[PDB]
Each structure stands twice: as structure tokens, then as C-alpha cells.
Amino acid sequence: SEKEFVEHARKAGLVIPHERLERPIHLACTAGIFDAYVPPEGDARISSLSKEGLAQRAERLKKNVASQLSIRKIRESDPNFKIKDFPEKAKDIFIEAHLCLNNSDHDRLHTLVTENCFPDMVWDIRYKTVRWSFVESLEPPQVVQVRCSSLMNQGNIYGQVTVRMHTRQTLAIYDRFGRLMYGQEDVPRDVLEYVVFEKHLVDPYGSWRMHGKIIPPWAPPKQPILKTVMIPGPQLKPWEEFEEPQ
Amino acid sequence: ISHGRVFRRLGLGPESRIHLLQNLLTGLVRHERIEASWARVDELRGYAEKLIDYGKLGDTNERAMRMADFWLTEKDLIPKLFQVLAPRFQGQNGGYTRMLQIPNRNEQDRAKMAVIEYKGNCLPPLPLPRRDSNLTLLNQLLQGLRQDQEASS
């Protein structure tokens, strides 16, 4: 007769076990982005001209002192580091990461993108079908700035490289039931982003991993959803009266 | 066989029923609006209607005075009964109380509950069930019929 239930799931965390860890948590990347590059608002019109964009992209990279010192530190930490050979590698990494996300190849996606980038690109998409393709590249990727964060407590240097990418992509996100949700698979829509890659310099292997995806504040709004969305109002208690904002 | 019966069985007997009704009437007089079981409120409606009539008989009426003394357990309500409820119910003949069924109690008993209220009280009005306006389709058709009847004479 004296029998009770078991298996009550609870998630209680305390500072004592967190601080009494025998081994510190090994981090393959930093938390976020330290210095966020703020692009000028005239980039959309400047991109219409080839030389008028390329000359400015070359000038801005060279004129900044922080980018030059970061590149010098990366070169002295690891040899055979070339800025000119970087944009092709970044383009290939981005394309392969998108293909891996299409194929749901989580292992290769983990090898390519970092731990701060994988959840943001897997969380809301793990239960949906993606048909992404690469068609054309209007403008070659351009390295804008290079940043390095050095933590002397552990002697770890993390180098992040920001690359402006103007791409022509076709995206079609389906639903778990097989019905189209987001967009069509044959429309070659043009996008412009800033990919921030991160590579640990102290690590002997040091694979180039994409870390952040910066969008300009003035970027055009994303394409409308195919469905209709209803936004609920504030739920009012019986003793609370509604206030209409104006 | 319960043919021709007007009083329902409540409490532990006749005296217990009388005491329960007396307590309910005292609460109703004190608060001007109470909520209880539907059967209890329905039974108390008649006594509440009779109490106003007794109060209207005047303060010096010994029968009314002793009736109020018996019923109103809290003696501070007797002056209130004779000087507030009775004076404000003068032209009204029998429209002294309003009873409305409220939704069942949230407790596990799920009892059928009603609310009784003295008219003209200083409390927010209950959500009374209001009739449809004359601007409705059927009401407007009936208004047209009424106009035709008036014009026919």
C-alpha cells in the first residue's frame, strides 16, 4: 500500500557546483562580436558601380590601423596568411554551409560553422525542408575589417574577419506537411550581408568558422510570409480597463 | 406526495430552516445585495418582500417592531430597516427585490447559485439581461405593424 510516484523533472542550478567544476569548460569561440562594423548607408548605390565600390573597399581596409594591426598579429601568430586568398575561401565555406544545412548534414555543418552560429541556423529549421541553391554572384566578396580579441587570463587569441558578401540566392522553405511556406524556389533574389568568420589562433588546427551574420539597418525588409498572421491584443483582467494608445 | 406545498425542506428541520433564512435576511439587509444558493435565494425572496411591507407599517407598530427584532439578528439594522429601506420603498408595491441566477460556484460542489438585491441600492448595476433594441429587423417589423394598427383607428 505504501507506494509513491517518482521521476519529477526539475532543472535547478546552483553556483556551488558551477564553481566546483574540476575542469573548466573549453570554448571553441567567443560569445558574440566585439566590434560590429557599421557600413555607410550609400553602399546600395555604390554597388551599382564596379570601380567606385572596389576602390573604396580597398582604401577602407588599408586606412584603418586596427585592421592592419589585427592582420599583422594573425600573420605573426600563424604563417601563410593571405588576405587576397581569403574571399574565395569564405565564399566556398558559406556555400558549403548552406548546402550542408539543405542536406541536414549536422556533422559537416558543425565542422564549418561555429557553436555561436549553429543554433541560430538549426533551431527554427530542424523541422522543415529547405531547397537553397546558388546561381550567381553579382559582386565578389570584399574583406572589410579584421578584428582580434586577446584574453590574457588563458592566453587565447580569437581572430574574426568581416567580409561583405553580395549574393544572388534562391530560397524555398517548405512545411513539415510538405506545403510551401516562405518563398519560391525559382526566384533569384539578391541579398547583401556581412559574414564574420572566427578562427582560434592558439589552436594548432584552427579551422575557419563562420561566427556572425550582420545585416545593415537600412536593408530592405524581408519578403512577406505567404500566410496571414493575427497578433493578439493584451489580455485584460476583469478589474482592469483597456487603454487605447494614440 | 408533495401536492400543494410552498415551503421547501432546508437545514436540519423547520427551526433550522427558519434560522438559516433569518441569517440570510440579516445579511441581505446589511449588505443590500447577497449571493447564495438558488433555492435558498428563491425561498428568501418572499420573506424579503414581506419584511419591506412590515417596515412600511411604521416605526411605532409593535408587531412590526417585534418582527424586526426577531428577524434582524444584528439590532443596528432595525433602525436602518425602518429609516432607509421603508422610506425609499413607498410608491413601489411589490417590486422590492431582484433575483438573478449566476454561474455555478467554482468549488467542486458546483451548486446552482443566485444573487438577490434590493432595488435602488448604492452598488454597481448587475449585468441585467436587456431586451433587443427597436432598431432590429423583427422589432422594426413589429413597429410597422403597430403603426398600421394605430393608423387604422
Binding site: 512577406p224 510570409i225 505567404l226 496571414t228 498572421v229 493575427m230 497578433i231 493578439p232 491584443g233 493584451p234 483597456f242 487605447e244 494608445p245 | 433587443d132 433594441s133 432598431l135 432590429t136 429587423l137 423583427l138 422594426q140 417589423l141 413589429l142 413597429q143 410597422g144 405593424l145 403603426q147 398600421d148
Partner: protein, 295 residues
């Protein structure tokens, strides 16, 4: 012209479908409109709807099925609006039912819908060898006991008048039409296409011309349910099945200097506002009388 009534119906439906296709192709993309809900029940509600695609019926579906069951009319921020008419711009919506405080607009919409249904029954309840031309639906107030529709019959049909059997046949046809649920569709067209849509009824052409004259943009509102197309003022009810009680009360032959017109008066009540048998009999008896209200 040597045209069968079925061929006329087919041509009208095809032309209406082509006009609707042109209207749909007028908007190439799906624009997002932010519509506020100004109703008394749920203030501050926001709907992200598709431009020229979403409808107030879809808004009611987003809210709850109770709105779809009860609400008949939509007030888009300045004017009445039928449930099956797509929205155009960002606005605010208020739903209107039969038992509202000021249901006059809904009563007018129901009156016009009943008149259109009666006209549809009359136009197709007559023999093919005879000619029947619908003139218009005279807007009489709700105080009048019956909705009226104007019909011009063949010249040889001017002697006889429909009897109780004919009225019961018309009522049965109307009830059969009600039995099948036929949504009411509203389309905004121009007089140029309305003339070719009708093209046969002189009275309808005159009505279209006089309705387009008062509109500087030459816009004619067309309503179509099933296979019947007609022009009427204002919006209509979303569903035919809303009409529960329906009767063809009487007919009155009014003779003018040019032609004689049969004014058919009928009585109807919705499912929400159905009345008792004796009340319905009294209302029908009142509706039996002549109704005269044109201006």
C-alpha cells in the same frame, strides 16, 4: 439575338470570371496590410493580411468561429463592407451583427440580399418562350413589411396574375435555393464592362448608366452568387443560408405610360431572428399590402 438562357448565363459567368482574373492580375505581388480591430470585444487586435486577397471573413476566422457565425457586416473604418470583398489598404474593422445597437446597415444589407434572391428566383422560374427583364430592386425602408423587386414580363403575360399555387411554387424555389449555400461575391467594375455583361436588359442598362452618372470614376458594384449576376447598391450578406424564413408575399401590377411592371413583394427573416408562427403570419399579412417607396 438567338441566344439560349443557358448560353446567356455562361457568357455572363465567363465575362465575370475574366474581370475577376484581370482584377487579381492587377496586383502582381502579395502586399502586407496591417488591419486594426476597433470592435468593442477585443481592442488593439492586429491582423497582418494579404492585400486584395484577405477578407473580413478571413479576419473573423482568425478571431473565432463565433464571429463568422454571428457577424454579418464589416465596417472598414468609414463604410459598410461585405465579408467576401477583399480589403485594399491598411484600415480598422468593426463587425456588425443583427442584434447590435444600431443594426440598420445590416438590415439594409439583408433587405437587398433578399431582394436579389427573389429576383434570381423570378428570372429563372419563367418559361423560356416568354421574356422576363429585371428592372431594379427599389430600396424601401425596414418599416415597410416586404422587400420589393421590379420585373417586366412578356406582353402576353399582362393579363394573368400569379395565384396562391404560383406564389407557393416561388417560395419553394427560394427555399431550394437557400438549401444550397451560395456565397455572395462583390466585384468593383466599370460601366464599360457592365454594359457588355448585361447587354440585353434595357432597364438594367439604364440602371447601370444612372448609377455610373453619380460616380465620377464610373464604377459599378456587381454582385454574383452561383450563376446569377445583378447590380445593387451597397454590400450584401456573406451566405445565402443566413436566410431561414422566406416567403413571396404578393405581386402588384403598376402600369406606367411606357410599360407595366410587376412589383413582387416578399418577406424574410434570418436564422438569428426567426419569429413565432403567429408572428410570422401577422407579418406576412401586413406584407400582403402594396408597398410604394421609390424616392
Amino acid at each position: 439575338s438567338q441566344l439560349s438562357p443557358t448560353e446567356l448565363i455562361e457568357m455572363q459567368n465567363d465575362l465575370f470570371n475574366k474581370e475577376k482574373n484581370r482584377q487579381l492580375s492587377l496586383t502582381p505581388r502579395t502586399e502586407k496590410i496591417e488591419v486594426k480591430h476597433v470592435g468593442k470585444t477585443d481592442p488593439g487586435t492586429v491582423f497582418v493580411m494579404n492585400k486584395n486577397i484577405s477578407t473580413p471573413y478571413s479576419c473573423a476566422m482568425h478571431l473565432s468561429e463565433w464571429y463568422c457565425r454571428k457577424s454579418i457586416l464589416a465596417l472598414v473604418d468609414g463604410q459598410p463592407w461585405d465579408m467576401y470583398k477583399p480589403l485594399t489598404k491598411s484600415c480598422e474593422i468593426k463587425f456588425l451583427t443583427f442584434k447590435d445597437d444600431d443594426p440598420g446597415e445590416v438590415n439594409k444589407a439583408y433587405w437587398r440580399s433578399c431582394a436579389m434572391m427573389m429576383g434570381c428566383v423570378i428570372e429563372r422560374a419563367f418559361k423560356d418562350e416568354y421574356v422576363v427583364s429585371l428592372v431594379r430592386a427599389p430600396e424601401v425602408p425596414v418599416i415597410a413589411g416586404a422587400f420589393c423587386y421590379d420585373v417586366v414580363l412578356d406582353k402576353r403575360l399582362d393579363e394573368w396574375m400569379p395565384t396562391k399555387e404560383n406564389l407557393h411554387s416561388f417560395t419553394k424555389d427560394a427555399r431550394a435555393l437557400i438549401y444550397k449555400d451560395l456565397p455572395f461575391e462583390t466585384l468593383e467594375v466599370e460601366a464599360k464592362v457592365a454594359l457588355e455583361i448585361f447587354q440585353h436588359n434595357k432597364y438594367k442598362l439604364d440602371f447601370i448608366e444612372e448609377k455610373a452618372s453619380q460616380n465620377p470614376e464610373r464604377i459599378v458594384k456587381l454582385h454574383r452568387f452561383g450563376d446569377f449576376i445583378d447590380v445593387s447598391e451597397g454590400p450584401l450578406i456573406p451566405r445565402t443560408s443566413i436566410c431561414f424564413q422566406y416567403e413571396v408575399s404578393a405581386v402588384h401590377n403598376l402600369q406606367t405610360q411606357s410599360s407595366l411592371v410587376r412589383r413582387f413583394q416578399g418577406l424574410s427573416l434570418p436564422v438569428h431572428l426567426r419569429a413565432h408562427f403567429t408572428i410570422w403570419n401577422k407579418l406576412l399579412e401586413r406584407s400582403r399590402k402594396m408597398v410604394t417607396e421609390d424616392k
